[PDB]
RNA sequence: AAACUUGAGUGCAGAAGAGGAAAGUGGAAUUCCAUGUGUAGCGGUGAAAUGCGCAGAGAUAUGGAGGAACACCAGUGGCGAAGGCGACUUUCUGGUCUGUAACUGACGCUGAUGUGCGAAAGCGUGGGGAUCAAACAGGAUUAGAUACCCUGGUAGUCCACGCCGUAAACGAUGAGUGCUAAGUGUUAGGGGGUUUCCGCCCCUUAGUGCUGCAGCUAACGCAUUAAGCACUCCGCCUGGGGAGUA
């Protein structure tokens, strides 16, 4: 939702794709691809910490 | 809400009553009341025109208003009362004018509770006002189809309809039965839903409960000689034998549609039944 | 595709030839039958 | 004994007279049954964050309640719902 | 539970001397005052299944400590059976 | 209704797909990677979106509405490659955003994908 | 102390710039003043004196 | 028959918590409908097709209805006896921990029979039905299908009340109390010591992990949260099938 001017626009990309992996978006839609089990996704988010 | 009794009899023993907790006087009031005779399914001319209809209990009947006239008077309700003409409970509302008339009881109505039926009114159950202040998306019963000929739509127990849309001087509602149609902006309709909800779940029980409502007996076509009905008489059981199921006057009866066509509410009809 | 039965019976020993070559059919196919994978390139 | 602090929003487009009505009715109610007012500010228009009921801004209220009984909130609580006027409301108790 | 005042005022009548809390009917008294307090809770909320094993645990504690008052002086388990309702 | 407006893309993991319309939406012009001649799965490429992008924004027309100020709503391939193909019609691309729908954890998502 | 859900502007550096929390790990505070936080932050998300999302 | 205070329990003073139950409130998303604007596909796959659309689809914008869950915070974190528990607020209510020592004076532990809780899927009586989805229907794949994949879809999933009482109900480890190298994360306190301009350091208590001696084990491994050393009580085993079956 960030506004970009007075520049090109192989700039503005360069702000949006790093104000987007910041973000919910991407990381977000992927796990919601499928409906995973109410307890496997305990232990995904376990693999996802204890990797930090 | 509903009794189950006790298999003390062969005739008693499947049969599921409905006590009659929402009801609060069991006496009608003196002054609404009608009499009214059994027309045992036979017409002026003094034959049976529709069938299977014969002498129930005695009835009387009890003048309710389906069309709501006194505009911004309240109206308290006394009671909920029994009514043997209609699926649904009816309700004894007082005016703070003072004149005492009858409307169909909705679901959650209780003693005590004003009611107001006019333009200028609250959108809470029991309140009569046109479909054109009725806000979109609240059901609503005791619909009014033409302007001032009182309500007709949506009137048994549980019955009711949601507000859709809004044209120019219509309004879109959905049906009990799921057909949505266009009623004329300019019509009342009661906001909630008629109550007596548990009504369509009584098991009768009994082919003697069948005859004090007044249903007489249906016999089969297919056990009928063949000047009776079309499925009249083979040797033994037959099957019907013929392309299709057939009524007791010669019209297929099993599928095929009986809505006259080129008729003035086509235009009004958006979606059929579901 | 080989297979071997040391049987004597000329008749009935393939009818176990024929069960050890259908095997081996199915152990090549299902390993190139996985060209299935749902690759998305960048 | 119970100390409250509830907050509500009335609309944007409501003129003078009718603002202050509004709120001398619920501190009236906010009074009933032993509860006492401790004290009524008002906070002026705020922008707030996002978009209930189409509206831009609202004028907020703080009350704080001294009671012992939630019988005086939890009737704002029945009356704030019905008026629609009065478009947000949140008592918390703090101990 | 209770609050503090009904506490402190149900200490006064079964106290046995000042500043002799602990002692065991006046440990009781408290705990029919809380026995009392939460099965009316429990009453008009039937599904609390959480806060009945609470319930039964402290019928289990005042059992116990009427039990224990009796094998060292019945004349005082009387006492308190006539002064509080209880049966047994 | 002259050099003002809001494009919407959403290039999903299939068929990309842009509608530019005014500032407040009324859907001025669409175009697909389907109206272009690819039936089914080169739908989802970036080369796609090097041609679905502006055969809508130029054969708009009726207004010549010039900008743009594109936003994002689907997770795809052809993302980031439908807005550096609209400075190939060359719209003054002026506020990109990533409005996409992201659930509070509200509904039912379908099963497992074996 | 205790984080008052009035008090935006130190409440509102610890949103994201979106409206979602910042996790501790990240900002840096500990386990119980990051708890009374979020009771904090998610009650002013409900009187709008925060967003949901930007 | 007396006396004691550590065990056990109550006080007093502090905390922490998705512990339950009921009633309210709220936002994003999904689906459906109504409308505006607008034009050929949309959807889907390893590739397609079934399906949907010119009776205006999808896409876009506003508004509505309804059901279900609660992104971020969120963590080898928290709480509960276990099952389990995740928006927010209020009411009602249970337990644990820390510290002080005022008080009661063994009041304790275990617990057959018994009596209550107990995921899901089920069953009953009604509700409600948004997504998802057994069965079922159709299209593809394959060597072949009733599988996998895709479109659609009923019970169910959700609520209320009664049931059912079973799970790899698992830490595959009963409960209680002592005792026995240390090192290290982290959660809830407490007392210190500097002082920090709220941040550390050391000691101690109760949780929760990861390493690792002694000791133990058949070996993997376990190791102050024992599977080490002891004592009490309870459940249970004594070859594999037949069988948790007559
Ligand atoms: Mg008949
Ligand atoms: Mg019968
Ligand atoms: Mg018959
Ligand atoms: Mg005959
Ligand atoms: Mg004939
Ligand atoms: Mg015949």
Redesign the pocket.
């Known amino acids: 939702t960030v506004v970009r001017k007075n520049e090109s626009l192989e700039d503005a990309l360069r702000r949006f794709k790093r104000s987007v992996s910041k973000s919910?978006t991407i990381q977000?839609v992927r796990k919601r691809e499928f409906?995973e089990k109410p307890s496997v996704k305990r232990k995904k988010?376990?693999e996802?910490?204890?990797k930090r | 809400?509903?009794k189950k009794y006790k298999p003390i009899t062969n005739g008693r023993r499947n049969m599921?009553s409905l006590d009659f907790a929402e009801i609060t006087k069991t006496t009608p009031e003196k002054s609404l009341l009608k009499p009214l005779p059994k027309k045992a399914g036979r017409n002026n001319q003094g034959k049976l025109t529709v069938r299977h209809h014969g002498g129930g209990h005695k009835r009387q009947y009890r003048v309710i208003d389906f069309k709501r006239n006194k505009d911004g008077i309240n109206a308290k309700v006394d009671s909920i009362q029994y009514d043997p003409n209609r699926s649904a409970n009816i309700a004894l509302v007082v005016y703070a004018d003072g004149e005492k008339r009858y409307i169909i009881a909705p679901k959650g109505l209780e003693v005590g509770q004003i009611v107001e039926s006019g333009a200028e009114a609250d959108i809470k159950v029991g309140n009569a006002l046109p479909l054109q202040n009725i806000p979109?998306?609240?059901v609503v019963h005791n619909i009014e189809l033409k302007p001032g000929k009182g309500g007709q739509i949506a009137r048994s127990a549980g019955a009711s309809a949601?507000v859709?849309?809004?044209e120019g001087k219509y309004v879109?509602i959905?049906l009990r039965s799921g057909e949505?149609r266009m009623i004329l902006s300019t019509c009342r309709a009661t906001i909630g839903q008629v109550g007596n909800?548990?009504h369509?779940?009584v098991?009768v029980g009994k082919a003697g409960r069948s005859r004090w409502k007044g249903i007489r007996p249906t016999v089969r076509g297919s056990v009928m000689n063949p000047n009776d009905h079309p499925h009249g008489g083979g040797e033994g059981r037959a099957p019907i034998g013929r392309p299709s199921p057939m009524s007791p006057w010669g019209k297929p009866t099993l599928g095929k549609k009986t809505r006259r066509g080129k008729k003035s509410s086509d235009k009004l009809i958006?979606?059929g039944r579901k | 595709l080989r297979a071997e039965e040391r049987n004597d019976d000329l008749y009935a020993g393939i009818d176990l030839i024929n069960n050890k070559l259908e095997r081996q059919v199915?152990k090549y196919?299902?390993r190139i039958?996985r060209?299935?994978?749902?690759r998305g390139d960048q | 004994m119970?100390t409250?602090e509830v907050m509500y929003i009335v609309r944007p487009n409501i003129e003078e007279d009718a603002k202050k009505a509004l709120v001398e009715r619920f501190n009236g109610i906010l009074a009933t049954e032993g509860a006492e007012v401790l004290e009524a500010k008002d906070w002026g228009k705020r922008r707030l964050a996002?978009?209930?009921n189409?509206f831009k801004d609202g004028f907020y209220n703080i009350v704080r309640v001294k009671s012992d009984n939630?019988k005086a909130?939890?009737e704002f609580?029945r009356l704030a719902?019905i008026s629609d006027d009065i478009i947000?409301?949140?008592?918390?108790?703090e101990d | 539970?209770?609050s503090?005042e009904r506490?402190?005022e149900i200490?006064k009548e079964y106290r046995?001397?000042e500043?002799?809390?602990?002692?065991?009917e006046?440990?009781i008294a408290?705990l029919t005052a809380?026995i009392n307090?939460?099965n009316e809770?429990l009453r008009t909320?039937?599904?609390?299944?959480?806060?009945?094993?609470?319930?039964?645990?402290?019928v289990?504690?005042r059992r116990?400590?009427l039990?224990?008052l009796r094998?060292?002086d019945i004349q005082r388990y009387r006492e308190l059976i006539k002064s509080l309702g209880i049966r047994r | 209704n002259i050099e003002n407006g809001?494009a919407?893309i959403?290039s999903?993991?299939?068929?990309t797909?842009?509608?530019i319309?005014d500032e407040?939406?009324?859907?001025?012009?669409?175009?697909?990677?389907?109206?272009l001649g690819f039936?089914?799965?080169?739908?989802?490429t970036p080369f796609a979106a090097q041609m679905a992008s502006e055969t809508a924004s130029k054969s708009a027309m009726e207004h010549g509405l010039k900008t743009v100020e594109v936003?994002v709503?689907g997770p795809g391939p052809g993302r980031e490659s439908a807005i550096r193909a609209l400075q190939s019609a060359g719209l003054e691309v002026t506020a990109i955003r990533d409005?996409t729908?992201?659930?509070?954890?509200?509904?039912?998502?379908?099963?497992?994908?074996? | 102390t205790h984080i008052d859900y009035k008090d935006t502007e130190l409440l509102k550096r610890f949103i994201?710039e979106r409206?979602?929390?910042?996790?501790?790990?990240v900002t840096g505070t500990?386990?119980?003043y990051?708890?009374?936080?979020?009771?904090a932050i998610?009650?002013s998300?409900?009187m709008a004196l925060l967003p949901?999302?930007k």
């Open positions: 919910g977000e409906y988010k376990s996802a910490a204890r | 809400a509903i599921t979109v998306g609240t949601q859709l849309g809004k879109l959905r949505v909800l548990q369509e779940l098991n958006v979606r | 199915r196919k299902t039958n060209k299935s994978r749902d | 119970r409250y996002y978009e209930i189409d939630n909130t939890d609580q719902k947000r409301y949140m008592v918390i108790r | 539970a209770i503090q506490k402190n200490i046995v001397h500043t002799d809390t602990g002692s065991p006046v440990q408290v809380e307090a939460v809770h909320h039937k599904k609390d299944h959480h806060s009945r094993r609470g319930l039964l645990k402290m289990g504690r116990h400590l039990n224990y094998s060292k | 809001v919407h959403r999903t993991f299939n068929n797909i842009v509608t319309t407040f939406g009324n859907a001025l012009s669409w175009s697909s990677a389907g109206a039936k089914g799965s080169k739908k989802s936003t709503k409005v729908p992201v659930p509070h954890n509200g509904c039912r998502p379908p099963k497992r994908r074996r | 994201s409206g979602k929390i910042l996790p501790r790990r500990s386990a119980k990051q708890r009374m936080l979020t009771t998610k009650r998300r409900h949901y999302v």
